[PDB]
Structure formats: structure tokens, C-alpha cells
Design a protein around this ligand. Structure first.
Ligand code: HEM
Ligand code: HEM
Ligand SMILES: Nc1cccc(CCc2cccc(OCc3ccc4ccc(N)nc4c3)c2)n1
Ligand SMILES: Nc1cccc(CCc2cccc(OCc3ccc4ccc(N)nc4c3)c2)n1
Ligand SMILES: C[C@H](O)[C@H](O)[C@H]1CNc2nc(N)[nH]c(=O)c2N1
Ligand SMILES: C[C@H](O)[C@H](O)[C@H]1CNc2nc(N)[nH]c(=O)c2N1
Ligand SMILES: [Zn+2]
Lengths: 411, 407
């Protein structure tokens, strides 16, 4: 079976055969599309098929499918699974797995970079302090004094699910958010719950609007521990606007390194529950979502007052005007400070190039339109008019329950 | 199988049971989601009739009543004999309103019950169709106080006698390919503008030439008709700040009136059913004016704004796009022509979603289409999970007539 997708702006049509390799379910049926739903301890029984398929993938990619090294590797994994109930990935396999999990992340507009992922193997880590050390080195390497480099650090895989490694932070660098008794929030409202966990775990909060949160790190199933990232490792960019001199006076800054640490990396049936990864920001992630979402810093009002906009009726589009200016300021600040950032125009154009190239060399490119289209100016970016097929390939990054809702507390 | 949709901006969760009434298929499977794809006999007809009549008589709280049972028998007898059947006026109106109500891609459905249905099933000629359309256009225009309306032409019989309005919308601007290379007027309508010329139309070859109506009755060759200009309300586009904006020579028409869709009620197929409401502002300013495949004026606008068009990261397109859309709303509002902005229309849709989940058990919705083409995340629909499924009565796509019509 072949499936065509059309770009309605360019009439370019592409044929997807890769969706045939898709095993996991999407959430949709013939009768209901769940395309806009955010989200629609594994025994030897189902593990070796997962292992075999990954190794079939891996050896195909190195043009060694069916070789003796391929058969011997299957046999070695087979006996290791039936003996030890799990198995260990070679370093080659882990690196392939990590890059392909990103390559397969259908919601990621940044995937043109997928093959340039720096993989740090932290599977020898055993303690929270050791995790802190690995994470610090990740942040320093990824940050590279503003010339950001994609990287992932992979901590030991789940075994029996009672010994998980977890990074309890949603991102390695995030600002605290404090709920005040009067109902107002200080800092990042997205982070109130995690901030309160940190403070309860002993963190002394500065209680400012841009406090970098501590790392809360869980090794081998033990209770998490608090560590402060050294501030010299945390690259931040003060946000100013190239024409509005009062913008700097809004006191805004953001950190430079987007580093997701709450997802689960699945490779050949193995589950890597702590796998922080980082790339670089698309400008709208800060300018549109982090500052302008009603449930975040929500500076639209203040920026619109300072621009002296007609804020009485929404049909004045003061919101849209303030939104563009905030996003101009974010891009200008990062570029001025020589910190890697990409605007949503450049990123989507690259994604289209990437996606076309993937259809030719790989037979398709799973893409979640709902997530790929930027949250402002959607239809003047070329992905808006691109039809996309969404399906699930492994290796993959998956969501996993927040650790504070599942963790058994030692004391 | 009783599904919840969360709004992530507000944490409000609604439970959808309405989807279990879904009959038609979405194009998705458990292995592949097609949410972003544009378009993924006597025995068949009576179950369709029964289903529609069953919901009709339920909606008037006469389900299981003598009148219900008698109408079911009556339509059963008419199908057995005539191999089709005719809708009571009441069923036609319910059917039409509910096809809008079920239009999962329509952000405007909060208005669904206030639809003016014009029964044109007595129509037999293109001239007759023209009369019905003019009356529709004039009624719906209402001197700028727009009113929703649908006009319903005779249902399909054997597919050889189809009524079709060949225009995609009753009112659309012509599109001409220049010898130099590019396109004058509306590029979306170039092929149709050609068919009009290729059928006899005398084009002014301007930038905003109202296209003629190409009307097909009972399956005959379509016929050209100029909509009287006094019925086509147009809005000159000016900006409430930039006086040079008027010099772009832009205007747009007030009445969006879709004419190429197929309306299906109780298995009956209404291949000609032009309907109209009023514009959301982005439909003109984002899509009509700024799509690269359309009027594509962003460059010229940003030029007149003296924006740095040298790097995309200046967001000069975004800045210009906003001003254009500010002007569209300002122009329509200044000329007292009905229009809604994407913030107001999306806020209305969430309220409407709330109502439908409350009084009906759900509301089919296609996030990819409900989210406006600009400023997506600062509208409430962006953070709204939605379930997409196909309920009937429905508006459906149908082949373009010139690919089908036997001449
Ligand atoms: C290098 C530059 C990168 C850019 C510009 C980028 C861009 C984005 C953006 C904008 C999103 C949408 C997330 C949101 O709006 O909340 C996303 C999603 C995602 N990205 Fe990328 N990304 C980059 C690197 C990476 C890397 C290195 C990985 C993993 C190795 C990755 C994996 C993902 C995944 C798994 C998602 C899914 C998000 C989710 O499911 O919540 N990305 N990306
Ligand atoms: C009254 C105010 C209305 C508003 C503000 C509105 C708004 C919209 C918008 C913005 C779209 C997206 C289409 C596009 O971007 O090209 C749409 C789609 C649609 N609308 Fe509404 N509309 C209105 C009235 C109506 C009426 C009166 C009907 C039928 C009786 C209708 C039926 C539909 C259908 C079937 C679609 C699906 C379009 C498709 O599948 O291509 N709408 N609407
Ligand atoms: N340019 C860029 C590059 C890398 C990372 C980013 C941030 C955008 C992003 C990418 C990937 C994942 C991601 O977040 C996953 C997530 C978030 C919140 C959760 C809350 C609860 C839970 N159980 N899982 C969650 C998973 C964000 N941008
Ligand atoms: N506010 C507002 C109110 C009413 C209508 C509109 C215009 C938006 C709209 C609504 C419904 C349908 C529609 O377009 C249908 C269409 C377009 C192109 C086609 C090309 C080929 C084909 N076979 N079918 C097509 C159907 C647009 N706005
Ligand atoms: C590829 C995608 O299906 C296509 O661009 C859609 C996206 N969403 C849309 N949304 C609306 N409201 N109108 C459209 O024409 C489209 N086009
Ligand atoms: C309800 C909806 O699925 C949800 O709000 C999604 C929509 N699309 C998105 N797209 C991106 N890039 N990031 C997001 O957080 C979301 N949120
Ligand atoms: Zn789907």
C-alpha cells in the first residue's frame, strides 16, 4: 500500500511507504480522529521481538542485514534476554537508537538536524551525584558558549521498574513559579507544581521571577536529590526589542538551552526513563508560548499597554501586534548575544526540505501537523499547506507519568 | 469509548458520547492519522432515511409516536415505489441546519440554528436558479447586516440530471494568467475564469472582476449569468493608520457563499446548495491576501511599511500580516458590514463546544481547521482538544463539474 500527501501551495505530491513499518497505534480509528489529543516492567515475552526488529533495523542501516555479525548479535541478544530477562545495547546501537528516536519524533519541527545528535552514554551512572555530573557536562557541551549543539545523555535503562533513573525536572533549565497567597503567580506558572516539590525537598527559593530551578535527580529508584546547576553553566539572554527601548525595562530574560528531561527513550524494547536531550530554541517557543500564553508569563497585556494599543476591542488585534513584537524581541536578543535560535519561518522551510528528503530516501516522514505548524503566523509558513501523515515508528520518545505520582518513597 | 477532551489552558474536561453515533469514516486508522489530509440504491437509501427521521422525531420529542411511525412507513412506501423520496419542508430545514451543526471544520457553528433555508426544489432551469441565487444573495447581504442562508436545489436523481453551481463561491474575483508570467486577479480562480471565458464570458481582465455565475440545471450545459452589481456588496480596504494602504487598490466582497458542496440529508443528495454566512477576518487577510498561491501582497505591503525584508527573523511577514488583517476588520466594520475577528469567533466556538457537549453530548471538530491561520496559540481553540468524526446530515465535497459533465 502506497499513500500520497499533497502540498496544496506547490502541488508537490509525495508517496509514503514508510507507514507500513508502523506497529504502534495512533489513537485514531476509522470512526474518530484523535489528531488533536495531547496524549491519546516489560517481560521477556514481548522483549525479543522488539529487540529483533530494532536489530534488523540497525543492521539494515549499516548495510549488514543478514550478515554473520547480524545473526551473531541476534543470538547474543536472544540468550541474554532469556538468561538475564533484558539485554544491553552496544554503543553503536544506542547512538543509532537515539538519533532515530529523534528522527521519528513526528511532533518535532527540528528534525533536519537528527543525524547530528551528540550521544552521551551515561549507562554506567549509579547515583544522583553521578547524574548531576553527567547533566552538568551535557549542559556545558550543549551550550558551547552560545553556539548550541544537539545532545542527549542516556542514563541506565529500566529493569524491574522499581529502580528507575528519572530527572524530575521537565527541562534541565526552567524558571521557578510561585503561587502567592493572593492568587497571583511569581515566576513561571508552568512550574508552580515542580517548584513546590523542590521547596518541600529542601530547596531554598530566591522567590524571584526568573530563578533557575534546582535539578531533582533520581538514581536507581532512590528518593530524588537536589542539585543547583552552577550558574556559570546556565546561559541566559536578556530580552530587549530592537526599536522599543522600554522593552528591556520589562525585566524579561530567558535561558538559551532547551533541554527536555521528562521523556522516555524506547530502543529495541528497552526503556530509558532518564534521557535528557537538548537542541536550540525556535523563537516562538519563548515568544509565543512561554511569554504570551494566558497560563504562562502572559506579558501580552503589559506589552500592549506600553505599545499604547487599542486594547478595548479584540478586533483591534492588539494581541497579535504585541505577539509579533515580543517575538521580534526574542529573536533579536538571542542573535545579538550570539546564542543559537531559529525563527519559525526558517525552521518550517527546513522541515519541508527535510520531509521531502525523507520521503525520497526513507519512504516517508511521520509528522504531526497540529504540532509542526508554528503557534503564530501558521499559514504563511510552508508547513501549513503541507499534508502530513502521522504514525508511530520505533525507536521513539514517549511520554511517561510524572515521577512524583508513581515514586515509592524510601524516606 | 466514552471520550474526554481536555482544554489545557483552562483544565476544563468535557466527555464526548456523541461520537458513538458516528456513521461515516474519517480516513484514519489505528496505524495512521490522516487529520491533516484535505480529503481522506433502494437498499442503501431506506436505512439512511430511517436514521435521519429517527433523529428528527427525537429532536421534536415525538420519537416512537404515531406521527413518527406513520412518517417512517410513508417514506418506506415511497422508496419501495419511487426508488427515492421527498423531504417534508420541516425535515429539509432540520436537515440543513444539522449539516452545518455537524460541519466539524466550521468555527462558526454557534449560529447553526439561525439558518435561513430557501427551498428551491421547485426549480427547473438555470434562469430559475439565477433568480433563486440573486434572492439568496440579496437576502443574505441585507445591506451589510449579513444573515446566514442556504438555498437548496432539486436533489440528485440519477446523476445525469444534477443541479450544480459551477462557481466555488457565488461571489469570487477573476484570475488571469499574464503573458509575462505571473497572474492578475485571484490565482485560485484562474482555471474557472478560463472556463467562463471558454464558455462566452467577456472578462474585463481586471484585478477584482466579479466572476459570472455558471449555472447547471437538470444536467444541461451550464449557463452564464452576471450577478447584478447592486447585489454584490464590496468593501474597499483601508488601514486605520497607514493612509498609503488605500493605494494598494484592495477591496473584498462582503458575502462568503460556498456553492460547490454537496448537502446530504437522510441519504438524499443535494448537489446544488449554495450557502453563506459572514467572513472571519483572517479568511480574507491571512488566506486571500497573503497566501503565496493567492493575492500574495505581503512583499508589497512590507515594502510600504519600510520593514527589514532582508532576513526572515525580523518577522516582517508577521508584522505586515497583522496590519493587513487589522485593515480588513477596520474596513468591514467602518462600512458596517458583518465580520468577526479570529479572537471573537474562536471564543464563540469554545462557548458553542461547551453548549454542544452539554445539550447534545459532544461536538465534532477538526482542530486543523478550527485554529485560525494566524496567532493560533493566543486563541482559545489552540489549547482545546477536539474529537473529529463524521455525523450526518453533512456537507461533503463533490467532484468539480467540468471533470464530470457530459457535454
Ligand atoms: C535542534 C533544534 C530543535 C528544534 C528547533 C526543535 C523544535 C521543536 C519544537 C518547537 C517542538 C514543539 C514542542 C512544543 O512546542 O512544546 C518539538 C517537539 C519535539 N522535539 Fe524537537 N527540536 C529540536 C531538537 C530536538 C532534539 C535534539 C530532540 C531529541 C533528541 C527533539 C525531540 C523532540 C520531541 C520528542 C518532540 C515531541 C514533543 C512532545 O511530544 O511534547 N528535538 N521540537
Ligand atoms: C455565519 C458565520 C460563519 C463563519 C464565521 C464561518 C467560518 C468558517 C471558516 C473560517 C471555515 C474554514 C474554511 C477555510 O478556511 O477555507 C469554515 C468552514 C466550513 N463552514 Fe463555516 N462559517 C460560517 C457559516 C457557515 C454556514 C452558514 C455554513 C453552512 C450552512 C457553513 C459551513 C461550513 C463548512 C461545511 C465548512 C467546511 C469547509 C470545508 O470542508 O472545506 N459555515 N467556516
Ligand atoms: N527547540 C527545542 C528543542 C528541544 C526541546 C524543546 C522544547 C520543546 C519540547 C520538545 C520535546 C519535548 C517537550 O516536552 C515533553 C513533555 C512536556 C511536558 C510534560 C508534562 C508531563 C508529562 N508527563 N510529560 C511531559 C512531556 C518539549 N525545544
Ligand atoms: N465565514 C465563512 C462563512 C461561509 C463560508 C466561508 C468560506 C469558507 C468555506 C466554507 C465551506 C466550504 C468552503 O470550500 C469548499 C470547497 C472549496 C474548494 C473545493 C475545491 C474542489 C472541490 N471538489 N471542492 C471544494 C470545496 C469554504 N466562510
Ligand atoms: C495541509 C492542510 O490540510 C491544509 O493546509 C489545510 C490546513 N488547515 C486549514 N484550515 C482552514 N481553516 N482552511 C484551510 O483551507 C486549511 N487548509
Ligand atoms: C489541544 C492541542 O492538541 C494542544 O494544545 C497542542 C496543540 N499543538 C501544539 N503544538 C506545539 N508545537 N506545542 C504544543 O504544546 C501544542 N499543543
Ligand atoms: Zn486521526
Amino acid at each position: 500500500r502506497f499513500l500520497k500527501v499533497k502540498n496544496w501551495e506547490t502541488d508537490v505530491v509525495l508517496t509514503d511507504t514508510l507507514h507500513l513499518k508502523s506497529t504502534l497505534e495512533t489513537g485514531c480509528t476509522e470512526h474518530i480522529c484523535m489528531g488533536s489529543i495531547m496524549l491519546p516492567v516489560r517481560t521477556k515475552d514481548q522483549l525479543f521481538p522488539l529487540a529483533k526488529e530494532f536489530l534488523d533495523q540497525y543492521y539494515s542501516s549499516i548495510k549488514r542485514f543478514g550478515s554473520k555479525a547480524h545473526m551473531d548479535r541476534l543470538e547474543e541478544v536472544n540468550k541474554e534476554i532469556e538468561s538475564t530477562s533484558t539485554y544491553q545495547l552496544k554503543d553503536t546501537e544506542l547512538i543509532y537508537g537515539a538519533k532515530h528516536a529523534w528522527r521519528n519524533a513526528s511532533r518535532c519541527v527540528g528534525r533536519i538536524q537528527w543525524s547530528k545528535l551528540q550521544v552521551f552514554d551515561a549507562r554506567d551512572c549509579t547515583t544522583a551525584h553521578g547524574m548531576f555530573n553527567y547533566i552538568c557536562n551535557h549542559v556545558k557541551y550543549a551550550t558551547n558558549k552560545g553556539n548550541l549543539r544537539s545532545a542527549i545523555t542516556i542514563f541506565p535503562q529500566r529493569t524491574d521498574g522499581k529502580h528507575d533513573f528519572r530527572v524530575w525536572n521537565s527541562q534541565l533549565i526552567r524558571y521557578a513559579g510561585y503561587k502567592q497567597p493572593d492568587g497571583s503567580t511569581l515566576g513561571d506558572p508552568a512550574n508552580v507544581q515542580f517548584t513546590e516539590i523542590c521547596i518541600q525537598q529542601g530547596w531554598k527559593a530566591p522567590r524571584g521571577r526568573f530563578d533557575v530551578l534546582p535539578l531533582l535527580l533520581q538514581a536507581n529508584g532512590n528518593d530524588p536529590e537536589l542539585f543547583q546547576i552552577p550558574p556559570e553553566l546556565v546561559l541566559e539572554v536578556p530580552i530587549r526589542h530592537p526599536k522599543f527601548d522600554w522593552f528591556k525595562d520589562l525585566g524579561l530574560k530567558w535561558y538559551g538551552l532547551p533541554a527536555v528531561s521528562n521523556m522516555l527513550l524506547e530502543i529495541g524494547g528497552l526503556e530509558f526513563s532518564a534521557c535528557p536531550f537538548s537542541g536550540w530554541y525556535m523563537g516562538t517557543e519563548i515568544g509565543v508560548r512561554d511569554y504570551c500564553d494566558n497560563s504562562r508569563y502572559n506579558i501580552l497585556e503589559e506589552v500592549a499597554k506600553k505599545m499604547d494599543l487599542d486594547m478595548r476591542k479584540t478586533s483591534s488585534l492588539w494581541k497579535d501586534q504585541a505577539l509579533v513584537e515580543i517575538n521580534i524581541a526574542v529573536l533579536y536578543s538571542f542573535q545579538s548575544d550570539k546564542v543559537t535560535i531559529v525563527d519559525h519561518h526558517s525552521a518550517t522551510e527546513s522541515f519541508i526540505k527535510h520531509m521531502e528528503n525523507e520521503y525520497r530516501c526513507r519512504g516517508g516522514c511521520p509528522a504531526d501537523w497540529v504540532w509542526i505548524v508554528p503557534p503564530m503566523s501558521g499559514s504563511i509558513t510552508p508547513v501549513f499547506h503541507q499534508e502530513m501523515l502521522n504514525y508511530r515508528l520505533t525507536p521513539s520518545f514517549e511520554y511517561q507519568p510524572d515521577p512524583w505520582n508513581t515514586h515509592v518513597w524510601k524516606g
